Enzyme design. Sequence first.
Site, PDB file in Angstrom:
ATOM      1  N   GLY A 195      39.373  44.725  26.372  1.00 12.76           N
ATOM      2  CA  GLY A 195      40.110  46.002  26.220  1.00 12.76           C
ATOM      3  C   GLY A 195      41.266  45.790  25.244  1.00 12.76           C
ATOM      4  CE  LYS A 244      46.721  54.977  27.880  1.00  9.58           C
ATOM      5  NZ  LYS A 244      45.247  55.173  27.642  1.00  9.58           N
ATOM      6  CB  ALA A 266      46.406  42.963  40.951  1.00  9.60           C
ATOM      7  N   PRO A 267      45.572  46.163  41.454  1.00 14.63           N
ATOM      8  CG  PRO A 267      46.032  47.605  43.255  1.00 14.63           C
ATOM      9  CD  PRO A 267      45.656  46.145  42.909  1.00 14.63           C
ATOM     10  CG  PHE A 275      49.070  42.697  37.093  1.00  8.80           C
ATOM     11  CD1 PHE A 275      48.947  41.396  37.623  1.00  8.80           C
ATOM     12  CD2 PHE A 275      47.915  43.443  36.764  1.00  8.80           C
ATOM     13  CE1 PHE A 275      47.699  40.817  37.822  1.00  8.80           C
ATOM     14  CE2 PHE A 275      46.631  42.836  36.961  1.00  8.80           C
ATOM     15  CZ  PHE A 275      46.527  41.550  37.495  1.00  8.80           C
ATOM     16  CG  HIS A 315      49.068  57.212  36.937  1.00  9.51           C
ATOM     17  ND1 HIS A 315      49.188  57.460  38.297  1.00  9.51           N
ATOM     18  CD2 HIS A 315      49.346  55.896  36.757  1.00  9.51           C
ATOM     19  CE1 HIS A 315      49.477  56.320  38.932  1.00  9.51           C
ATOM     20  NE2 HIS A 315      49.591  55.356  38.025  1.00  9.51           N
ATOM     21  CE  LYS A 328      45.261  55.960  37.375  1.00 13.90           C
ATOM     22  NZ  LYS A 328      44.676  54.654  36.902  1.00 13.90           N
TER      23      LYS A 328
HETATM   24  N1  LIG Z   1      46.639  46.655  37.291  1.00 16.89           N
HETATM   25  C1  LIG Z   1      47.596  47.277  36.580  1.00 16.89           C
HETATM   26  O1  LIG Z   1      48.775  46.835  36.637  1.00 16.89           O
HETATM   27  C2  LIG Z   1      47.227  48.360  35.652  1.00 16.89           C
HETATM   28  C3  LIG Z   1      48.240  48.852  34.672  1.00 16.89           C
HETATM   29  C4  LIG Z   1      47.773  49.839  33.772  1.00 16.89           C
HETATM   30  C5  LIG Z   1      46.451  50.294  33.765  1.00 16.89           C
HETATM   31  N2  LIG Z   1      45.583  49.806  34.727  1.00 16.89           N
HETATM   32  C6  LIG Z   1      44.171  50.135  34.645  1.00 16.89           C
HETATM   33  O2  LIG Z   1      43.697  49.394  33.453  1.00 16.89           O
HETATM   34  C7  LIG Z   1      42.623  50.111  32.834  1.00 16.89           C
HETATM   35  C8  LIG Z   1      42.899  50.316  31.340  1.00 16.89           C
HETATM   36  O3  LIG Z   1      43.994  51.263  31.244  1.00 16.89           O
HETATM   37  P1  LIG Z   1      44.502  51.689  29.797  1.00 16.89           P
HETATM   38  O4  LIG Z   1      45.484  52.829  30.042  1.00 16.89           O
HETATM   39  O5  LIG Z   1      44.918  50.523  29.022  1.00 16.89           O
HETATM   40  O6  LIG Z   1      43.177  52.345  29.216  1.00 16.89           O
HETATM   41  P2  LIG Z   1      42.696  52.527  27.657  1.00 16.89           P
HETATM   42  O7  LIG Z   1      43.898  52.727  26.756  1.00 16.89           O
HETATM   43  O8  LIG Z   1      41.595  53.493  27.659  1.00 16.89           O
HETATM   44  O9  LIG Z   1      42.200  51.059  27.300  1.00 16.89           O
HETATM   45  C9  LIG Z   1      40.939  50.535  27.775  1.00 16.89           C
HETATM   46  C10 LIG Z   1      40.340  49.862  26.521  1.00 16.89           C
HETATM   47  O10 LIG Z   1      39.122  49.212  26.961  1.00 16.89           O
HETATM   48  C11 LIG Z   1      38.151  49.455  25.925  1.00 16.89           C
HETATM   49  N3  LIG Z   1      36.809  49.184  26.450  1.00 16.89           N
HETATM   50  C12 LIG Z   1      35.966  50.038  27.062  1.00 16.89           C
HETATM   51  N4  LIG Z   1      34.815  49.397  27.399  1.00 16.89           N
HETATM   52  C13 LIG Z   1      34.957  48.120  27.013  1.00 16.89           C
HETATM   53  C14 LIG Z   1      34.153  46.891  27.045  1.00 16.89           C
HETATM   54  N5  LIG Z   1      32.918  46.949  27.610  1.00 16.89           N
HETATM   55  N6  LIG Z   1      34.680  45.747  26.490  1.00 16.89           N
HETATM   56  C15 LIG Z   1      35.921  45.715  25.935  1.00 16.89           C
HETATM   57  N7  LIG Z   1      36.704  46.811  25.872  1.00 16.89           N
HETATM   58  C16 LIG Z   1      36.269  47.980  26.397  1.00 16.89           C
HETATM   59  C17 LIG Z   1      38.406  50.864  25.511  1.00 16.89           C
HETATM   60  O11 LIG Z   1      37.724  51.202  24.288  1.00 16.89           O
HETATM   61  P3  LIG Z   1      37.403  52.785  24.111  1.00 16.89           P
HETATM   62  O12 LIG Z   1      38.680  53.606  24.227  1.00 16.89           O
HETATM   63  O13 LIG Z   1      36.843  52.820  22.685  1.00 16.89           O
HETATM   64  O14 LIG Z   1      36.298  53.091  25.084  1.00 16.89           O
HETATM   65  C18 LIG Z   1      39.927  50.861  25.443  1.00 16.89           C
HETATM   66  O15 LIG Z   1      40.408  50.408  24.152  1.00 16.89           O
HETATM   67  C19 LIG Z   1      42.410  51.398  33.625  1.00 16.89           C
HETATM   68  O16 LIG Z   1      41.400  51.177  34.651  1.00 16.89           O
HETATM   69  C20 LIG Z   1      43.782  51.535  34.339  1.00 16.89           C
HETATM   70  O17 LIG Z   1      43.728  52.304  35.542  1.00 16.89           O
HETATM   71  C21 LIG Z   1      45.934  48.856  35.570  1.00 16.89           C
HETATM   72  O1  LIG Z   2      46.972  51.937  40.064  1.00 20.66           O
HETATM   73  C1  LIG Z   2      46.444  52.248  38.955  1.00 20.66           C
HETATM   74  O2  LIG Z   2      45.371  52.861  38.868  1.00 20.66           O
HETATM   75  C2  LIG Z   2      47.279  52.091  37.732  1.00 20.66           C
HETATM   76  C3  LIG Z   2      48.477  51.388  37.778  1.00 20.66           C
HETATM   77  C4  LIG Z   2      49.285  51.370  36.622  1.00 20.66           C
HETATM   78  C5  LIG Z   2      48.862  52.021  35.479  1.00 20.66           C
HETATM   79  C6  LIG Z   2      47.649  52.710  35.505  1.00 20.66           C
HETATM   80  C7  LIG Z   2      47.137  53.490  34.364  1.00 20.66           C
HETATM   81  O3  LIG Z   2      47.899  53.628  33.354  1.00 20.66           O
HETATM   82  O4  LIG Z   2      46.062  54.105  34.447  1.00 20.66           O
HETATM   83  N1  LIG Z   2      46.889  52.728  36.639  1.00 20.66           N
END
Ligand SMILES: NC(=O)c1ccc[n+]([C@@H]2O[C@H](COP(=O)([O-])OP(=O)(O)OC[C@H]3O[C@@H](n4cnc5c(N)ncnc54)[C@H](OP(=O)(O)O)[C@@H]3O)[C@@H](O)[C@H]2O)c1
Ligand SMILES: O=C(O)c1cccc(C(=O)O)n1
Lengths: 245, 245, 245, 245
Positions: free
Chosen positions: B8, B12, B103-104, B106, B133, B137
């Site tokens: 990814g 973002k 982890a959901p 960090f 959010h 999302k």
């Molecule tokens: N655990 C935490 O602390 C935390 C914090 C923030 C977000 N999240 C979660 O993290 C995930 C990503 O969030 P985000 O806001 O960064 O989303 P985002 O901006 O859409 O970034 C996801 C990236 O992954 C790419 N992607 C899709 N399929 C892929 C593959 N098979 N291999 C490699 N890359 C691929 C996407 O490309 P395309 O756009 O071209 O499809 C995109 O550039 C979401 O599930 C979110 O809920 C978790």
């Molecule tokens: O709990 C989640 O699903 C989560 C946590 C932080 C950021 C994001 C996100 O930006 O989607 N999502």
Amino acid sequence: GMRVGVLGAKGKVGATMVRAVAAADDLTLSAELDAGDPLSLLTDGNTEVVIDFTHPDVVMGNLEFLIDNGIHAVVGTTGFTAERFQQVESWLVAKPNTSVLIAPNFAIGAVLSMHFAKQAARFFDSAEVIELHHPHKADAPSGTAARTAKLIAEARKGLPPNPDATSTSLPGARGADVDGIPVHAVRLAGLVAHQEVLFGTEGETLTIRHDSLDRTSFVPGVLLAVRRIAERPGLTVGLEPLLDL
Amino acid sequence: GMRVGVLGAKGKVGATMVRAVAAADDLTLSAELDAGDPLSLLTDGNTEVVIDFTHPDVVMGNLEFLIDNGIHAVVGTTGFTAERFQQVESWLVAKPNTSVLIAPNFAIGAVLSMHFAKQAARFFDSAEVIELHHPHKADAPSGTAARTAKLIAEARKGLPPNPDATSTSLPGARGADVDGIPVHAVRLAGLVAHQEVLFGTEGETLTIRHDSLDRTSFVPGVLLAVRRIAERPGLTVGLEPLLDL
Amino acid sequence: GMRVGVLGAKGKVGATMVRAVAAADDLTLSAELDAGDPLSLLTDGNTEVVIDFTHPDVVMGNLEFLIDNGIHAVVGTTGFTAERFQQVESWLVAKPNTSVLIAPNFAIGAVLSMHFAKQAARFFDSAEVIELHHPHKADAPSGTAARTAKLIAEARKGLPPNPDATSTSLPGARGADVDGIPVHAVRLAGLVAHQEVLFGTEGETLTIRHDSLDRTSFVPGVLLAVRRIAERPGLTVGLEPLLDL
Amino acid sequence: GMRVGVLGAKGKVGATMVRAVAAADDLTLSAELDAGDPLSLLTDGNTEVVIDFTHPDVVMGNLEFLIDNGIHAVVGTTGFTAERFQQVESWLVAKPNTSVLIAPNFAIGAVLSMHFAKQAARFFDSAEVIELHHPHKADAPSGTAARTAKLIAEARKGLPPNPDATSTSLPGARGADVDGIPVHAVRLAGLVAHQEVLFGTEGETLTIRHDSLDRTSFVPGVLLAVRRIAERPGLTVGLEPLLDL
Ligand SMILES: NC(=O)c1ccc[n+]([C@@H]2O[C@H](COP(=O)([O-])OP(=O)(O)OC[C@H]3O[C@@H](n4cnc5c(N)ncnc54)[C@H](OP(=O)(O)O)[C@@H]3O)[C@@H](O)[C@H]2O)c1
Ligand SMILES: O=C(O)c1cccc(C(=O)O)n1
Ligand SMILES: NC(=O)c1ccc[n+]([C@@H]2O[C@H](COP(=O)([O-])OP(=O)(O)OC[C@H]3O[C@@H](n4cnc5c(N)ncnc54)[C@H](OP(=O)(O)O)[C@@H]3O)[C@@H](O)[C@H]2O)c1
Ligand SMILES: NC(=O)c1ccc[n+]([C@@H]2O[C@H](COP(=O)([O-])OP(=O)(O)OC[C@H]3O[C@@H](n4cnc5c(N)ncnc54)[C@H](OP(=O)(O)O)[C@@H]3O)[C@@H](O)[C@H]2O)c1
Ligand SMILES: NC(=O)c1ccc[n+]([C@@H]2O[C@H](COP(=O)([O-])OP(=O)(O)OC[C@H]3O[C@@H](n4cnc5c(N)ncnc54)[C@H](OP(=O)(O)O)[C@@H]3O)[C@@H](O)[C@H]2O)c1
Ligand SMILES: O=C(O)c1cccc(C(=O)O)n1
Ligand SMILES: O=C(O)c1cccc(C(=O)O)n1
Ligand SMILES: O=C(O)c1cccc(C(=O)O)n1
Ligand SMILES: [Cl-]
Ligand SMILES: [Cl-]
Ligand SMILES: [Cl-]
Ligand SMILES: [Cl-]
Ligand SMILES: [Cl-]
Ligand SMILES: [Cl-]
Ligand SMILES: [Cl-]
Ligand SMILES: [Cl-]
Ligand SMILES: [Cl-]
Ligand SMILES: [Cl-]
Ligand SMILES: [Cl-]
Ligand SMILES: [Cl-]
């Protein structure tokens, strides 16, 4: 002087209103009706105006009687919809000197919130409403949050819908849809009546939050409506038409 | 030293993580994969650990490959459920020296929120979670709010359900039901990632609110997990097991 | 059975406490003293324990009498400082079987807030406390916010102070300084008693907010302290030592 | 087309503005000045309008030069007071075709907040402002919170002051006094720029909260002012005069 009856006189808000009418020098309490009391107690007591804080399942029947008997009504009970307001207007055609005011919130901070939500709506890409009430409340969402959402949606006529990329969801996570505006209803012990209107655009948000911590907050608006009710024959929705906003 | 890949990498959060790995003196960036890049780029680059911030529809396939190839994984992508965690544990039986941490959230404020929600839950009659959010999302509710609700529900095993007198509702007004706990998901332009946990009892409420205003808030927790990943073979859920709480 | 007196019996909180003692099956109301009533009414009525919700200018004199007469005390009145607690300990040396518990908040959400603030403090660069109360309150900041700030400061012993680049200010804008922690006191019609503890670090914040919307929220904690007061001879500060946290 | 210079071009907001002017099709970047760059770089580059996001200790000197050289100015730097605005008006008498707009917030949610605060003020007994910013900010309280307080105080001319029974306080607990309105300034790592305006009366409160989570929120308002600056010769305070509110 004015003879005022209260419907729902033993309820949380109605008991507050009984005390307020009793304390007011220019109002006389003419009836205090609880569940199971016949509406004929209102005509027996020569009641001129009624305050109604009852329940969504009974208020239309109360109004049907009040209007047929020429008793003006200040209604706080919620559950209203456009079809119910149309029905109230239909009954009032037969009784052109009777006045009814129905408002989902008599607290000035909620009235101001709805006014500010209308003014802000066109400046933001996203809008949603969160309402939070005590867990004895029958209706979700609240009357105030449904009216706020309707006002925002009317204000945004012709603008794009809220952006939302949701593709996987549990049922109900995104709220109820009121004219395209998500509305979320929290029911929590400890609360009274609260609402946040949230607006968002690039890099920023605006939140308008109203909190009624005590049901005394409803009294000034109800008494104002009681005092001015006969000024506007027919139906008035909201307290805003009585104010200078 | 450690060879770290990012899945990814143009997203973002993933772009933030690429910069963080590149800046870290003890980590070397070994792969940066975007949508449409083959996972074999990870083995071509001799990657030891991967950070995954991709999408709920692709993360299980990424994990299946990572585990089969003995590459440890630090996963932030959401969409997880107990069945998916069971599946990850099933794949790890074949690869007993490989470590996965999912982890959901960090950010330390969210980790602390979930810890405090577990401690507070038994003291209150009512609990609900509101999460808010940005409108890009994919999943509602968020991973963090589903885990928070699950923790609250486990903590309240054997206590009465939340009180709620709702008898008339629009569909979805009361949120999604996660193990008996209402969860509401707001999607608003301007936001990043936010959550409020609300508890109520007679006369009072407690709200625990976490706000990530910048995705830099996720970096310390991810780097800690990357650095400690091989300490715990098998699956770790959440960042809390790496901390002293 | 226990003979309980209330000092401040006509006050906002004291009247709530009179009703609670009267309703409790295991407690008997032995005295209800208001301003201008002599403390000898407590010994006339054979009072065993007193609840004190009076005023910062009178509570030390009440305690001096209670301790000299061997009457245990549960004190909610604020205005306390370390020197006043030292004075109470000095008086209790002469009366080793008398118990005093002084707490700046008996609501469980505030007790939990102070507990969570202690746990969170070392994870963040910045911490401040905002408290918000009705405009009849004598003391600013509140007892609860001063104790919260003191707990945060103790928890952060040896860590850097809050960052702050302020170089031009109006007097008072940055709050009161309690052991290095800014505390801000809002006094607003409509409010009861509220506090937000705010923590910040790179890209994120954590807020712990407690709201007492009704003085009934103080009753469970006071009655628990009354019931357990004689268990701990001497001085107990806070309600937390009676709880399992 | 318009030749736009930026003063403070390497600062947090100024760097955002450099990128915005560079991206705009109708604007050309004519100068980017940092600390230690001479203002003559602006006339060397034939600059027509300048955006200033610098520091309270230098902005008046920047304005003195800009006005003497007939360069219009859009100023976001804070530290302004009525005497400084009078001084700017005095310099503009000599240069009747030069335009200056000084605003303490260019984000639409903050502009709307100040507009709603003016409308709400006369309906409530109490009003206070809490502002919360990152800990690199030089001035407390913020420009936006001082203007909001001044607007509330003007709106409440002739009404009673806020009620407040405080009799014992630590210095600074009750905020800075801006025309009778308490203003509290929180400085916390993690934050960007935030403000809550709080109003209270019997039983209820209204809170208007604005949050800028990203400095991109300031760009639309600045570019609007740049584009319309020469429409109003002389001094304009705030962005509201350019809007339809
Ligand atoms: N655990 C935490 O602390 C935390 C914090 C923030 C977000 N999240 C979660 O993290 C995930 C990503 O969030 P985000 O806001 O960064 O989303 P985002 O901006 O859409 O970034 C996801 C990236 O992954 C790419 N992607 C899709 N399929 C892929 C593959 N098979 N291999 C490699 N890359 C691929 C996407 O490309 P395309 O756009 O071209 O499809 C995109 O550039 C979401 O599930 C979110 O809920 C978790
Ligand atoms: O709990 C989640 O699903 C989560 C946590 C932080 C950021 C994001 C996100 O930006 O989607 N999502
Ligand atoms: N507009 C506003 O500002 C505002 C403010 C607050 C509340 N509300 C709305 O006002 C309504 C009342 O709220 P509440 O919290 O006061 O509810 P409540 O405590 O349940 O009070 C309603 C009372 O009405 C009684 N009642 C039911 N049917 C009746 C009938 N046919 N005649 C007379 N009384 C009857 C109930 O008796 P039983 O309990 O025995 O059935 C109860 O005592 C709700 O719809 C609420 O949403 C509006
Ligand atoms: N620990 C907690 O959980 C908690 C919760 C709420 C409040 N508090 C604190 O409790 C105190 C009381 O608050 P409140 O809002 O109830 O105040 P309040 O309404 O002013 O009540 C205090 C009462 O004490 C009376 N009084 C004054 N001197 C007295 C004396 N010598 N003997 C007996 N009574 C006396 C007052 O009489 P007059 O008005 O005639 O002087 C008044 O009726 C304050 O210090 C407050 O900060 C603590
Ligand atoms: N109106 C609004 O919407 C709004 C929005 C945000 C901020 N503000 C205000 O805007 C101002 C800037 O905020 P900021 O956070 O961007 O501050 P910042 O990051 O410190 O940026 C100010 C920049 O100005 C530079 N500078 C200082 N003296 C200068 C001079 N004589 N000529 C050219 N540049 C000079 C500084 O250099 P050094 O660091 O080397 O000294 C710094 O790079 C503050 O007064 C703030 O309160 C207003
Ligand atoms: O909008 C409403 O539905 C409303 C407003 C204030 C109070 C209540 C209530 O207590 O149910 N309901
Ligand atoms: O911490 C305190 O000072 C406190 C706590 C709850 C209520 C009150 C009060 O009403 O004054 N004061
Ligand atoms: O009103 C102000 O002072 C203000 C407004 C937005 C941002 C900032 C800042 O970042 O300092 N300051
Ligand atoms: Cl409808
Ligand atoms: Cl008629
Ligand atoms: Cl209205
Ligand atoms: Cl699950
Ligand atoms: Cl293995
Ligand atoms: Cl965790
Ligand atoms: Cl002290
Ligand atoms: Cl003794
Ligand atoms: Cl405690
Ligand atoms: Cl001034
Ligand atoms: Cl000129
Ligand atoms: Cl403005």
